[PDB]
Amino acid sequence: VGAXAXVXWXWXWXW
Amino acid sequence: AXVXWXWXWXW
């Protein structure tokens, strides 16, 4: 849950 | 993975 990879920002589910 | 909760920075 964050900026980078996963959920939130950057890659995966979000911005 | 990067900045936030989990790993990298933050928690």
Side-chain angles (χ1 to χ4, degrees), chain A residues 1-13:
Chain A
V1 179
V7 193
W9 237 89
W11 179 252
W13 191 255

Side-chain angles (χ1 to χ4, degrees), chain B:
Chain B
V3 198
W5 287 9
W7 254 324
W9 263 13
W11 190 253

